[PDB]
Amino acid sequence: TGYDLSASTFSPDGRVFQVEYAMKAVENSSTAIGIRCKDGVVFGVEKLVLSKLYEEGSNKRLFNVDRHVGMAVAGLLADARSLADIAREEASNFRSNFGYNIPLKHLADRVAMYVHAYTLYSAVRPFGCSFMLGSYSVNDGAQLYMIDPSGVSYGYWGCAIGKARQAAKTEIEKLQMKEMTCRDIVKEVAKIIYIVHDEVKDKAFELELSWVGELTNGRHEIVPKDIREEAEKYAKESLK
Amino acid sequence: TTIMAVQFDGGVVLGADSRTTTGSYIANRVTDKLTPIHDRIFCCRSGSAADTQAVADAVTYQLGFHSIELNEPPLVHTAASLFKEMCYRYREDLMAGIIIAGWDPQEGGQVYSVPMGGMMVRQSFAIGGSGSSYIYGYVDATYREGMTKEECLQFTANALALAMERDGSSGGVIRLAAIAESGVERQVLLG
Amino acid sequence: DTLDPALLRPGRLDRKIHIDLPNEQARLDILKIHAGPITKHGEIDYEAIVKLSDGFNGADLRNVCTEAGMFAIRADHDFVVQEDFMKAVRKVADSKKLESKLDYKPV
Amino acid sequence: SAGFDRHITIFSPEGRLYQVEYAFKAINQGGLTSVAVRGKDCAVIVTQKKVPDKLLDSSTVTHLFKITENIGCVMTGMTADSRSQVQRARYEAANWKYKYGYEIPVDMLCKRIADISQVYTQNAEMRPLGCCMILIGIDEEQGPQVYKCDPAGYYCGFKATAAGVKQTESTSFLEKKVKKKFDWTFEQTVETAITCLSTVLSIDFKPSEIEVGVVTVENPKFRILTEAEIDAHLVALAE
Amino acid sequence: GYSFSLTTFSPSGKLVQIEYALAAVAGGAPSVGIKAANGVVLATEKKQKSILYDERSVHKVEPITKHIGLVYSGMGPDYRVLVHRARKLAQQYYLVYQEPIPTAQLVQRVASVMQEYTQSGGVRPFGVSLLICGWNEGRPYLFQSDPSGAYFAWKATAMGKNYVNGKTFLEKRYNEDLELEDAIHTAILTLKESFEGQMTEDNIEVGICNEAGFRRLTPTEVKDYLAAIA
Amino acid sequence: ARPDKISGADINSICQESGMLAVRENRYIVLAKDFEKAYKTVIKKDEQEHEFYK
Amino acid sequence: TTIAGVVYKDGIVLGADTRATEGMVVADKNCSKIHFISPNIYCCGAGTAADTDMTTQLISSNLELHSLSTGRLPRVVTANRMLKQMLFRYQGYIGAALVLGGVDVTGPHLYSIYPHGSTDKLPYVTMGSGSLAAMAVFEDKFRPDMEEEEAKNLVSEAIAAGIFNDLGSGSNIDLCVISKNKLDFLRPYTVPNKKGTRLGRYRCEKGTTAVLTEKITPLE
Numbered sequence A: 001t002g003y004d005l006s007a008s009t010f011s012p013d014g015r016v017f018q019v020e021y022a023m024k025a026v027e028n029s030s031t032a033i034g035i036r037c038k039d040g041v042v043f044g045v046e047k048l049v050l051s052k053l054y055e056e057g058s059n060k061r062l063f064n065v066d067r068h069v070g071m072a073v074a075g076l077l078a079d080a081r082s083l084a085d086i087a088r089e090e091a092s093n094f095r096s097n098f099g100y101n102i103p104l105k106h107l108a109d110r111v112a113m114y115v116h117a118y119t120l121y122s123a124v125r126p127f128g129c130s131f132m133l134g135s136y137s138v139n140d141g142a143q144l145y146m147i148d149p150s151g152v153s154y155g156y157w158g159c160a161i162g163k164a165r166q167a168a169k170t171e172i173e174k175l176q177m178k179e180m181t182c183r184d185i186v187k188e189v190a191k192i193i194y195i196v197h198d199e200v201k202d203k204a205f206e207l208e209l210s211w212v213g214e215l216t217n218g219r220h221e222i223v224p225k226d227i228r229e230e231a232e233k234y235a236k237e238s239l240k
Numbered sequence B: 001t002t003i004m005a006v007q008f009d010g011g012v013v014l015g016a017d018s019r020t021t022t023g024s025y026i027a028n029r030v031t032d033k034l035t036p037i038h039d040r041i042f043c044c045r046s047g048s049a050a051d052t053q054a055v056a057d058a059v060t061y062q063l064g065f066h067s068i069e070l071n072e073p074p075l076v077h078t079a080a081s082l083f084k085e086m087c088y089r090y091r092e093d094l095m096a097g098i099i100i101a102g103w104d105p106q107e108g109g110q111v112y113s114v115p116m117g118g119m120m121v122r123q124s125f126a127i128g129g130s131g132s133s134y135i136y137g138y139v140d141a142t143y144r145e146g147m148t149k150e151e152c153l154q155f156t157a158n159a160l161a162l163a164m165e166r167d168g169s170s171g172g173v174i175r176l177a178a179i180a181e182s183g184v185e186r187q188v189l190l191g
Numbered sequence C: 001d002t003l004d005p006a007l008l009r010p011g012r013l014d015r016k017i018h019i020d021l022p023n024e025q026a027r028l029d030i031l032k033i034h035a036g037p038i039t040k041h042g043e044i045d046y047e048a049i050v051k052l053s054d055g056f057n058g059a060d061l062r063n064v065c066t067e068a069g070m071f072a073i074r075a076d077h078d079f080v081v082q083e084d085f086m087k088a089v090r091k092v093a094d095s096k097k098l099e100s101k102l103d104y105k106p107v
Numbered sequence D: 001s002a003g004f005d006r007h008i009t010i011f012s013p014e015g016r017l018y019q020v021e022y023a024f025k026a027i028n029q030g031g032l033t034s035v036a037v038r039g040k041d042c043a044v045i046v047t048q049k050k051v052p053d054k055l056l057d058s059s060t061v062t063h064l065f066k067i068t069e070n071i072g073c074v075m076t077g078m079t080a081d082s083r084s085q086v087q088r089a090r091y092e093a094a095n096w097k098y099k100y101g102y103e104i105p106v107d108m109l110c111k112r113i114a115d116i117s118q119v120y121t122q123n124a125e126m127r128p129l130g131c132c133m134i135l136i137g138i139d140e141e142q143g144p145q146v147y148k149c150d151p152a153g154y155y156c157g158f159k160a161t162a163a164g165v166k167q168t169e170s171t172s173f174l175e176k177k178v179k180k181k182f183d184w185t186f187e188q189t190v191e192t193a194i195t196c197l198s199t200v201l202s203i204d205f206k207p208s209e210i211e212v213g214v215v216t217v218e219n220p221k222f223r224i225l226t227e228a229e230i231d232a233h234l235v236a237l238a239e
Numbered sequence E: 001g002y003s004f005s006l007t008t009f010s011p012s013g014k015l016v017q018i019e020y021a022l023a024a025v026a027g028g029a030p031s032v033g034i035k036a037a038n039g040v041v042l043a044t045e046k047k048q049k050s051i052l053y054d055e056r057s058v059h060k061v062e063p064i065t066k067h068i069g070l071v072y073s074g075m076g077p078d079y080r081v082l083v084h085r086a087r088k089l090a091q092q093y094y095l096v097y098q099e100p101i102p103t104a105q106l107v108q109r110v111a112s113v114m115q116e117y118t119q120s121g122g123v124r125p126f127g128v129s130l131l132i133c134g135w136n137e138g139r140p141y142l143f144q145s146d147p148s149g150a151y152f153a154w155k156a157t158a159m160g161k162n163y164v165n166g167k168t169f170l171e172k173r174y175n176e177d178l179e180l181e182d183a184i185h186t187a188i189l190t191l192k193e194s195f196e197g198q199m200t201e202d203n204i205e206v207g208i209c210n211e212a213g214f215r216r217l218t219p220t221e222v223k224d225y226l227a228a229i230a
Numbered sequence F: 001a002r003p004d005k006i007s008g009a010d011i012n013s014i015c016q017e018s019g020m021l022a023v024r025e026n027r028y029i030v031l032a033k034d035f036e037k038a039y040k041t042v043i044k045k046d047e048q049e050h051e052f053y054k
Numbered sequence G: 001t002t003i004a005g006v007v008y009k010d011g012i013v014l015g016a017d018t019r020a021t022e023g024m025v026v027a028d029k030n031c032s033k034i035h036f037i038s039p040n041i042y043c044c045g046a047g048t049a050a051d052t053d054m055t056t057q058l059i060s061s062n063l064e065l066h067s068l069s070t071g072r073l074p075r076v077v078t079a080n081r082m083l084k085q086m087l088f089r090y091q092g093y094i095g096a097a098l099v100l101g102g103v104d105v106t107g108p109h110l111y112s113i114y115p116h117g118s119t120d121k122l123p124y125v126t127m128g129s130g131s132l133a134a135m136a137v138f139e140d141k142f143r144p145d146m147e148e149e150e151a152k153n154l155v156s157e158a159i160a161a162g163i164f165n166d167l168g169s170g171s172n173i174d175l176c177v178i179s180k181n182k183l184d185f186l187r188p189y190t191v192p193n194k195k196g197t198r199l200g201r202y203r204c205e206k207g208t209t210a211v212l213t214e215k216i217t218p219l220e
């Protein structure tokens, strides 16, 4: 209510309304959650078909930045694509300059500085994205981070990005998260996404699940979800 | 001149002569030929002097900044990669015989070698310097796999002793460095 | 917003005073007096409503009591269960968040 | 007044500018408190954490940022400005170490950070990084130091130091507390830090919420405390 | 609602954003500086806000070379910037000519810099008025500059709060011919005319300029001198 | 004998400040307490806000 | 040109010889080769004179700037790092054979710089053209922790041997002593070589030269 025009100006009470408006820009986007286990990180995105015009296999928000790192973006899609390319470039610089895999803390800090640099000046707008970052390493374990539109980047066990941000983490936290391997966590994420919004406002959605950990031996890829088909034979048992 | 690096089970052991010469005149009789970069990583140099000093300072810069940003102790292979990039990028002007060694928490003691070209290799032992050909003659004779610390110290003592005795540029006094998980133990021997 | 400096002189406003929101234990106070005319079991978690809601208003706790009473009217119960209080936490503390310019002090 | 709607950084009539004095409470939107104390050959930082979530971690919520091997710091205000300010501080300390051959004193670092903030302030079309920075460090022939850096670029540095949300009250306690001429035997320092935050906020809580950073002229390395010894000091000051 | 910004003249008057910077200077901390027969005395007024602050960290009286003193009345964050500029600039002169720069040449070049920031149109002026002095070639000098790029030459002047009142005391009290100690006495007199009630060895901060060079006095000699100097 | 200039309205505010500040303690006259309390309440510390740019 | 450096029990004694030859002809009998850097650090130069001069004035300016910016006494290692970085940045094009000496808080520190950028910390160095004779005198008669007059006599002996060997100087060997408190600088230390007195008055007279065109121009 101002004074809301530039991303450089302050308010009479001291905050930037551009950054706030960009934070609640991602609020309208699709619900995307993530959670780690004791030997891996599992992603899951509530993805919706528009009506009947899609192809079930386009524009997947589960990206794949490095050999062991991928994104779980939510928000404006093309801006997230550009940010994913920036992250690929940064992992490229690290691999080219030091000869080994990027630690996830340093990658997240560089990306947070990049997002902050787009929040600073007045020529540019803040990003309209909020994404997840997972990894796994034999000397480091599982690490799950989280980047807001402003650039505040710190770590979680579980998170959620979308409409049901509260309404997922209400029952994310009742998971016994440490003592489970991720092969349980697959159907756990399946049941969590399947709980929120079956048919009420929209018609149909579709599930994607990314998957990194020790079971992939340090690789990051989408699950063979058709293999073991663990959502639906349990999703139909989750309505009662 | 003649520099040497030997690893063992616990850690690594380095060594050098001193005798910085120019032509046939000795400019300096005693020299720290090996250089600290991190608290667990050394490098010992040969070739031209100013080149290796400036390269070692810039590597100290980049590695210290990087290792503070990681908030973790650095790797040895990282520093070897830094020397590889900076050596290879200006191979046209530098003459570096940089040998990287050092103990690491994840990987123990390691020895990497970067000669004048800019290639990088991991070795179990290394020579270096213009008067290194001779102990390179018998370093594949006296070496035994799985030495102790004292065997490595005696080994490099005999090595640098014979290299200093024979080569004209080499000589002076023997400086040693022992890098392990515990600490860095330097001493100055003669014999 | 617009007030006199001569209003602010000693002699007409010789003493003035400030009030905090609660200190989170005055939250407990306003809740334990707002936990008044409510049929219950005596199991109403005051710490959960104190820490989980952030209204900083006796009128907000009034709305909490009102909508928790409506959610005992809903599902047909005489008693307002602690989960009706948390339904009040959710709905009331979200409709509470439809406000901007949450600050006021003259001069 | 204004009037001028303070949109850019110009001079208003009578006679101030309003951008920086709006930036001074961008610290106050952080919801956070910091206290620094220098009594003797040690120096103590104390700062709490506001973690409402059990899903959120606890290690990466640390505000104490080890800048170099002998210099720690703490940040308040918004987090992005703070972290960018921290990487600039690290970068410039490394630039000192490259250019001048020895470890940077904590004074020149505060001067350089303030000057960067002034350049961000003097020329427009960049936000002036609305975060406040408190530094600590040990110097030879001077003992310990405690400094404060402003978002405006106004550094100063002194014995008992506090910034955040509630530090008019903290400086009221530090005037009412650093007036008696006793020595500060390092647990007096830890006790006065814990109890000054415990009297300003009046919470008297677990050892798992505050973060304690110390540096001492016995180990000039910057040092972050563990839950056990924080608990030991907290019940050691419990009378 | 005009002027706005720095690129255009008023309908008849002047450059309002320079006028406001001069007003912001006049709203600053007081100072006084006096040219005597043999030396120049500078004196400022440095109050800590609380009892917590240290008086050994920030310094108002500041040398630019070994024989050139310089104080201000304004904002330190700009003061240090143009101090650094004057440092680097004076050392460039001493590189070129192998000779210590004259104070008039300092004031020329610093005025050129300040003028260049008063030039259009995105940067604001300094909110700092200087008082430059030095003992070049026997005769000592005293030079006031301003945010607008202009400069002057004084026998004694003041800047900050109540500079008018301090100036009416300077016109009455001071004269042309004194020595440095009497200059310090009348300087602490005119600062004590206008400063706060607690004036100690730390609230003021005094540097002099002998012909033997610049000298920044210590709290030892300040406490010895201001131990009820009158 | 003090400087730190205090005007007539400010003087009368100090006197009434101190008188009320002792009578609210149920006293007869100030025993020099509330005069110095009126100083260290009334001055009233040059504002707070801002101690930058002076 | 034969400059030398040494470390006695407290500080550094520097010496120099001031014959600035340009090729094969003695062009100077008094050339200050001991240069100013700071109130505690000095420097000597060898080889190309103007390169050493311009470089030492630049580095002295930069250290004056840094020291006045800091507010305390400079460090020698900073001077060393600036010099080696500059001389390596010129890739050895600039020939500047430098001896760097000063006393910090840590104490006395002596550095010799070879003009590509190779530097060494030593208790004693010799640089220049006739440096070998002074290094002979040093290697013969050095002992650790000398006293003051002992070190002065030694450095004088070394530069004297450099002068009795070739390309020394006619000059009266210059010395300079840096301590923790007392800085000294002594140009006419010892004059061994008095010039022989002239044997005839080969003075011209008032008119022995034909003049073609005169001019007088008055002044103020």
Ligand SMILES: Nc1ncnc2c1ncn2[C@@H]1O[C@H](COP(=O)(O)OP(=O)(O)OP(O)(O)=S)[C@@H](O)[C@H]1O
Binding pocket: C006, F008, F009, F010, F012
């Ligand atoms: N000479 C004096 N001696 C004693 N008390 C004085 C003296 N002058 C002023 N005062 C006090 O200060 C007050 C001055 O009158 P005010 O009401 O302050 O005038 P004012 O209208 O408020 O100010 P303005 O400029 O007219 S709006 C008096 O009522 C006294 O309390």
